[PDB]
């Protein structure tokens, strides 16, 4: 359910 990128990726 989590996913995407971010500033951690």
């Amino acid at each position, epitope marked *: 359910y989590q996913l995407r990128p*971010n500033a951690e990726t």
Partner: antibody
Amino acid sequence: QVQLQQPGAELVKPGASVKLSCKASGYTFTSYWMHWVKQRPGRGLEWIGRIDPNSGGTAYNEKFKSKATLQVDKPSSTAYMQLSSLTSEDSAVYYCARYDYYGGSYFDYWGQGTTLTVSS
Amino acid sequence: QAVVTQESALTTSPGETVTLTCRSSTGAVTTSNYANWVQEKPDHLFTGLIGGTNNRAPGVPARFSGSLIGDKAALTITGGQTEDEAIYFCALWYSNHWVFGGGTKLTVLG
């Protein structure tokens, strides 16, 4: 010539803790993230977390934040991961894998893994 | 684990095209899952091949490509080689962590 070197094996007793090493060579240590993955031939690979040697920037798998600690030593170009309060469930092969993050997003080179055996 | 799943095992022959897939239990594999494909050959020799869904890792044969197919990530091997017999791992990104698949053992009749 990109190389990651990890000790072959380590024996420890339950309750102890270890400091696994990953010597990096063949590239600029600071411009690549370093990841650690745990493998228990049995139920696959698990991502432990990542550390940015350049900024010390750290990222842990929730399931491993109280178990592992990542750091590096720039002069020696080697990444370390200390595991604490060892148990049999910690027995496994531990890999360090180099990671590029830019307009990229990869895992290129992998050390050959240190198989840790936690047994009394 | 957050649960990525792959074909248990597959078999191809030198020169053929074989495609490996990767499922996310949450839903359709997306560009934001930054699909990674890793290869493991005898004696824990792991090599990254594909990252960010279709970016080929430098120093990787051109016959390896990555993409999406339906609601899954795909690793395509065109013109398969004998040396491609190995185990292939999928890895998806879920906001704050990587999740690997069980790995597909690929046999290249050589």
